[PDB]
Amino acid sequence: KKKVCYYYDGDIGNYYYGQGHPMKPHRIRMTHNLLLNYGLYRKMEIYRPHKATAEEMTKYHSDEYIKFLRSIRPDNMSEYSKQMQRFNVGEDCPVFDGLFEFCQLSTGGSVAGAVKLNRQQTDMAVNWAGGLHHAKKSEASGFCYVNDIVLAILELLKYHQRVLYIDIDIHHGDGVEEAFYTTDRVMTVSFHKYGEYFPGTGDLRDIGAGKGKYYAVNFPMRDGIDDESYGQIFKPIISKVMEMYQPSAVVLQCGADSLSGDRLGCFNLTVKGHAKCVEVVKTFNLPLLMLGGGGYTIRNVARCWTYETAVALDCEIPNELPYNDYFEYFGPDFKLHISPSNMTNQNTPEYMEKIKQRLFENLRMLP
Amino acid sequence: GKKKVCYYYDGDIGNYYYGQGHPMKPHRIRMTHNLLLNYGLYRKMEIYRPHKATAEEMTKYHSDEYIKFLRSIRPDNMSEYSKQMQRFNVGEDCPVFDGLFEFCQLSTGGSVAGAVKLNRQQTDMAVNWAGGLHHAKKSEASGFCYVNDIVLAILELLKYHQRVLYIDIDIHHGDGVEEAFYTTDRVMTVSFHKYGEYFPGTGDLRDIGAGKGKYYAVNFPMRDGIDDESYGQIFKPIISKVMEMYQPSAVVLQCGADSLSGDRLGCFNLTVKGHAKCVEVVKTFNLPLLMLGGGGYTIRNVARCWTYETAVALDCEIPNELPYNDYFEYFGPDFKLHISPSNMTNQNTPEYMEKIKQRLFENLRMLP
Amino acid sequence: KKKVCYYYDGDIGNYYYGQGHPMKPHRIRMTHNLLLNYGLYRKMEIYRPHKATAEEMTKYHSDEYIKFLRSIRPDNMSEYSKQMQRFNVGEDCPVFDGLFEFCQLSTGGSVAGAVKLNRQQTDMAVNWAGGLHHAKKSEASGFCYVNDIVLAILELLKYHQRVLYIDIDIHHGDGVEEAFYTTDRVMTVSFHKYGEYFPGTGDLRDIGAGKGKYYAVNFPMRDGIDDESYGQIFKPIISKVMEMYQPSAVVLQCGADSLSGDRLGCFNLTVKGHAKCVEVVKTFNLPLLMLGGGGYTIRNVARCWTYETAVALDCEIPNELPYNDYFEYFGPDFKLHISPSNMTNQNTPEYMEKIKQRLFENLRMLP
């Protein structure tokens, strides 16, 4: 069947955002340990990504911002207060030990993955430490400092005329959208919570500009969407995008903060419902880069990305979790799949149908 | 909802003549007025005649020596003032004409009277199309402008308002206003203008203010041929962010019509609807607003533009079919209010516009 | 630090070859404006070239040809139809307004630079308006009218016994190679596309004649050479030449039509890979005259010669372009450095090594 390359650096789990910060890079090491215990390592090639250089990052980001990220340290923040304000670093995007190397490792895997797809050495590349969709050319945002997605897409664009980016993180992928907002060579499609919610962008009316008009697609949702409502909008929209846009490569950001029970998210998807998106994208048989993203209930991120790796591999894995280094975290059930909550779905059928119809109208405006 | 609008007009303004072949025609203000009367917009607004601003008023900004020269110089005594004419940059672009000082007094009186009415909360909006003379400097004429009514009106506003936002959509850089306020944070100046080998030569986006004023000057340099779509996609986002970060309590909008398609001196491609979208954007913030004229050299389009911007200020839909008026033949061959863009190339790519916007947003982050 | 002087005349960008003609002197004005906005003027001496006189030009070119260039105008062309034919002016080398002054300004910067180098007033001289390597003794060729390189080298040869000429334009530098083909006082080294390509000369087997046998070196290449491949043969070739020939002055023609994406060329070098050539030549610490040459995607010509000027000054400059008078021409990315394309490199590793080995054989035949 299909070949799968997978990127993991065993140091990624050691980076620490600071006491009380919801972002926990350990979740990637948990993910990896669970998947190795299911035996999915016998079925894919595992590579340690090279660290992305600062020069590689300045393909998109400004030199002064990258020089700042490379220079700032917890003990020198006082000498950089004007730069912190300029680049939005210090609060929600804190300065921690090893910040710059954390950026190099996350970016390294995404770019390596793109390179391996360009060379046709693989069908699918996976980098769960990637997916940092909020970072901007000269600004950190939303816990993200360097936009690994944009840099991987710039690499795909050397060999692919049209690239399709799909984003199922609960948040609008605003950094990626902004990077490509005036081009038709990248189509961005984001499903997200919208309305008094971070980052504030991703309105139905934001459809791109210039040559990029109609090549940005946003599906704004309210709280509580569930597996059935979501899957009934995802498949028809992505089907129509594939038909109208005909991309030659696809990048899928699989942020797990859209899962029921997420610490910061308000959606009601299960692991099966989230992974249904992966299965759908796979049926189009295009070179695929699968990336991580948000996810704050870390036992549920590990289950989500494990199951999505198995989907990538076309492997049915048992519901009963194998023994692993983090086994106790998954109690008291020790199952792979999760139950939705009883939260109210605030997306009415009329609302969902009205949005879908507008997006179909916009997709009909493509060449 | 709908605002009180006070409108300033002196029926004498149209008689001032810059001289043979000079492209500034104050007659365009009389055309604008006549067109708006004929659409019936006078029923909806209060029409006031500006006072003649005095030397006391003008020297709140300009030098006593400059304003004394302006009060003294005449076509008949020019030959005695050859030296001073050089010093104050009067005599070529900024000619000596009969009634020069009175034209300055009338232009200025409407802007300053409007600022007073706003300060007193007697109106939500004040309009002076004879104003907007943004190039004049503290001791020098420039770019057809002699007295900076804008700087004087902003000084009047600053008596009651801690922060004033100035927005300039004339095709030229609003350099006299920027220079006056370059070292203060109490006026933020935002100019969109053609930049590169074009008058007055200033307004690089790297000019951002200085001292307490650093970050409170915003310049958006553009190339030839900009059109409604391109302009409208950067103006609303920049103005929204400026409003968010600076939180002004009054606004002054210079609406120079030399940014329209077909302008004799300008090289942009905006329609009357594209230019007026700026007024509509600024209005949505519901702040006391002084709307001023500025350049504009194809006079039939100037009258169209300012008539429509008045109707916008009034929330009043006017028909595209122009009513009969005293200047009706100047609006041929179509006799419509709206204009079409030309086929000129837009040298401002959508990437260039987003890139400049992104660079100015980085500077707006530096506001406290 | 080695001293750099740089020549530019502000009128150069106004000369126009005519509608549809690919050579655009405006590229020189774009280059100048980018390096002014990078701040590099602070670090070099900038001079306006003199207009070279007919006396200077006839140090090489025939009196009759220079007299014709001085005379010919769009409004008297009808009267000169036979001379146009004889001197090959009027087609790919059009008659245009101010032709002769264009020639004078380009030549004046190269000869003036060589005079500064001979007087030991500078270590490096740069003239991006120069590098017109196809012009012949009595005829125009390849958009070139007056061979400023040959005249500069004749200036250098007043003070220097041996001068090395290196040419990294994609075309063989035939006018220079021909001028010196029978002398050992100039060694000419050209790397160029060869095989049914302009100007048709520059075979590996063309090695000089008479006293100049072995003092012409040609490295013929195929489409798609990349930075990796070019740099692996340029350094060893140039090092061996320097060891065996021991020049006391170097002239480097930096034609940018060897860059990826050129409108007329077929190579895949980036600005970094092209500028590595300048870095290598600089390590020998010889008086160096750096000249322009072809280049037809003018945004990338401006990037390349700006970055090469920075290299001459030993100054790294940021990838983020500064605002400048032509900033819109550098979209969509507004970065200094460019990416290679996915074009196939037709130069195999074995081909490169085999040709390298053949040239190393010829080089071993020097004293």
Ligand SMILES: [Ca+2]
């Ligand atoms: Ca999303």
Ligand SMILES: [Ca+2]
């Ligand atoms: Ca797009």
Ligand SMILES: [Ca+2]
């Ligand atoms: Ca302006």
Ligand SMILES: [Ca+2]
């Ligand atoms: Ca200011």
Ligand SMILES: [Ca+2]
């Ligand atoms: Ca060559």
Ligand SMILES: [Ca+2]
């Ligand atoms: Ca020789």
Ligand SMILES: [Zn+2]
């Ligand atoms: Zn998220």
Ligand SMILES: [Zn+2]
């Ligand atoms: Zn103007």
Ligand SMILES: [Zn+2]
């Ligand atoms: Zn060439």
